[PDB]
């Protein structure tokens, strides 16, 4: 019977909440109070990647920390060279309504997706010289957001149909489907160990997923609005979220509760993209108030404010060597800050 | 030039990419984009037919003007998460069925959607081309059933003209910003060839007014 199932379901949820509360004894603030803060950090616009003619929706850095790809409102997917202003590639899209892009760790592939409910994989290194779409992936019933390459052959995609999917490129088939979110899933991040990935959804909850098993290993709450961003800590045992309620929270995998609430009273605009520094001390967070904010992740303060852009910062990335941070806003510019 | 041969040719490649990219951007800005919204297939299919998984893009030309209709409705997701993708669209084609006052009420849901779209954070500047489809079926329904069932506060009668005018006026009244944006209402039905002309005339007004506001003359 439905009622007798739901009563014990909410009892079990209360049991989980009690287990989390008992397991928490000292907040991250109490023991991070001992160390001195990083102080004010004033990064500057080293490069300004102009060339888009519309609103930029996503970016992803390369594993070489020099190449990055950006997707804009116009049907264009540009691959940059961060050490210069050069455009390595600029490839058109079948659907201009692109909401995400990912750059494969090997650099051989770049993905994109959006309102077409399709993740398109582009082969960058071909003998033809141009860039050809390779096995555009269909099967999601909602707008696809924040696809990420697990490797050269497996890509995990999130869509606005409350599901996440794992694909095989040769036979695009949405092999593992991650179901259990109530609202649209906005962003996902991959753990460095390449075994687990967490996804944030519009149901004001984030779930940790087992890629091989396909089960929802862990679930996290605390946000009271749509979670628009998520990013793993560099060690893989923690992650940070950014939601429309203008607050960033630092969860962790070993426990099941939050550690920080990176929020400011003067900030009332939601977060669009969140990124971490190489050491994990700096929590970059792209905000809706036309500029990005730098947070000391161990502390709960604001080390610096990335200089304001012409529009809301929609995308954000930190190089694998941490040498630079790149933002892209709803204007047509990407900025590298170092 | 303190640059090698490879990097100089990379700069040349980037400049070529910039030129063709700007050409594509200019050709995309030259054409006009339209956004389609019905209230539960209340006329979207028939308005696409009259004017010739994911979202559907319809391309058509009328009097040397390339139109792009982005028909959403198959998304079946939260509109708040992708409705900002269409900010900057030239106009919004909103379709409602006149023969739905008797059929909560479908017309009231249409009004709710219209209020949500017009009074949006993104669609402030963009004008809205409202469509009132299936006027013949509404003729028949009015001749068969009174309109007072849909509108408890109605001062009209069985006449078509006053009922249609009242529905239109209720639709304009849903706008809270009658100066930043204006609604181009129209009455049409099936097998009506004047509807594409209405869209063209209305969008020409939208384009001229937008250019004049960019000049500070409006």
């Amino acid at each position, epitope marked *: 019977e439905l009622d007798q199932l739901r009563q014990e379901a909410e009892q079990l949820k209360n049991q989980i909440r009690d287990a989390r509360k008992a397991c928490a004894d000292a907040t991250l603030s109490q023991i991070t109070n001992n160390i001195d803060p990083v102080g004010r950090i004033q990064m500057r616009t080293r490069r300004t990647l102009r060339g888009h003619l519309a609103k930029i929706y996503a970016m992803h850095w390369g594993t070489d920390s*020099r*190449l990055l790809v950006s997707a804009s409102q116009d049907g264009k997917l540009i691959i940059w*060279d961060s*050490y*210069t202003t*050069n455009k*390595v*590639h600029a490839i058109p899209l079948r659907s201009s309504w692109v909401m995400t892009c990912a750059y494969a760790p090997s*650099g051989n592939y770049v993905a994109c997706g959006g309102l077409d409910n399709i993740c398109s994989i582009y082969n960058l*290194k071909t*003998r*033809e*010289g*141009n860039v050809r779409v390779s096995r555009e992936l269909a099967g999601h019933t909602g707008y696809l957001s924040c696809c990420r390459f697990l490797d050269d052959n497996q890509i995990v995609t999130s869509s606005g149909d409350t599901t996440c999917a794992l694909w095989d490129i040769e036979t695009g088939q949405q092999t593992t489907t991650f179901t259990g979110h109530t609202g649209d899933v906005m962003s996902l991040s991959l753990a460095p160990d390449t075994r687990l990935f967490v996804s944030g959804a519009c149901d004001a909850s984030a779930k940790l997923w087992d890629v091989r098993e396909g089960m929802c290993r862990q679930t996290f709450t605390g946000h009271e609005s749509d979670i628009n961003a998520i990013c793993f800590f560099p060690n893989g045992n923690a992650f940070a979220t950014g939601s429309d309620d203008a607050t960033c929270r630092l969860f962790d995998l070993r426990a099941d509760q939050e550690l920080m609430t990176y929020s400011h009273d003067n900030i009332i605009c939601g977060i669009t993209s969140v990124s971490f520094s190489k050491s994990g001390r700096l929590l970059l967070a792209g905000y809706d108030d036309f500029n990005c904010n730098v947070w000391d992740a161990l502390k709960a303060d604001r080390a610096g404010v990335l200089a304001g852009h012409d529009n809301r910062v929609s995308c954000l990335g930190v190089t694998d060597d941490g040498m630079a941070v790149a933002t892209g806003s709803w204007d047509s510019f990407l900025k590298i800050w170092n | 030039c*303190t640059l*090698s*041969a*490879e*990097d*100089k*040719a*990379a700069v*040349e*490649r980037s400049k*070529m990419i910039d030129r063709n990219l700007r050409e594509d951007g200019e050709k995309a800005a030259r054409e006009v984009k339209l956004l389609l919204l019905g209230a539960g297939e209340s006329g979207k299919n028939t308005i696409v037919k009259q004017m010739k998984t994911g979202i559907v893009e319809t391309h058509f030309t009328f009097k040397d003007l390339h139109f792009k209709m982005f028909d959403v409705g198959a998304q079946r997701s939260e509109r708040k998460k992708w409705i900002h993708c269409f900010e900057g669209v030239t106009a919004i084609i909103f379709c409602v069925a006149l023969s739905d006052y008797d059929l909560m009420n479908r017309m009231h849901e249409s009004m709710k959607l219209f209020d949500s779209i017009c009074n949006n954070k993104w669609f402030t500047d963009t004008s809205i081309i409202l469509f009132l489809n299936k006027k013949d079926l509404f003729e028949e329904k009015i001749k068969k059933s009174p309109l007072t069932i849909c509108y408890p506060e109605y001062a009209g009668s069985n006449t078509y003209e006053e009922a249609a005018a009242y529905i239109q006026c209720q639709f304009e009244d849903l706008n809270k910003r009658k100066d930043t944006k204006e609604i181009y209402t129209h009455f049409t039905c099936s097998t009506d060839t004047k509807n594409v002309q209405f869209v063209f005339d209305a969008v020409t007004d939208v384009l001229i007014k937008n250019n004049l506001k960019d000049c500070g003359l409006f």
Partner: single-chain antibody
Amino acid sequence: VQLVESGGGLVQPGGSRKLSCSASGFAFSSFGMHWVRQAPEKGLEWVAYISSGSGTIYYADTVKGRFTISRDDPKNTLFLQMTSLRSEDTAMYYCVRSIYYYGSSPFDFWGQGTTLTVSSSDIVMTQATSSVPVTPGESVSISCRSSKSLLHSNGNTYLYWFLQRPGQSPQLLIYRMSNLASGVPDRFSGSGSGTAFTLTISRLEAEDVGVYYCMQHLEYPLTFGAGTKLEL
């Protein structure tokens, strides 16, 4: 991917020839095009260069003012108008594909070439010798030396390695010093210090025999070296 070429043949001295290079199987409009020639017995020698979408029309010192080079992107064909042919221009010209984005591999594909016979400062690089004996299944080191340092401030050593099978066109192996090509066996490897460069082959096979070429790409006049032929 094809770069078939047409033209050539015996030409009286002072004559004119109209070489053609019909590209096929790739985006010819986005590829820089080179011309490379070799004497019927000597090593490779760079000729000219046309960038993507025309633009840069770099020539060589021995051909400046002549050998005007043009491209036709819509027809995917490359041309080389030849003026005032001399007895020193007898060579088999190669239509070399090239692309120059970051991480690209210039000089990947070479055409089969057309033979041309005519009846009767810049970086200089030389190799160890004109022939190197080596038994199959053994590792040998092939060395080429340069006058000016090929390492640039950006950190890229624009040293190139090409292998020419007997009767076949050159095939790129190491497009930048210590950076292996695509489609070549992993046994080939490159190394260098900035002026002296050595190539390791790591237990070569039967098909690895041929002529090796070392090309710089720093100062745009591209100079090859006296090829190191490998005894079979």
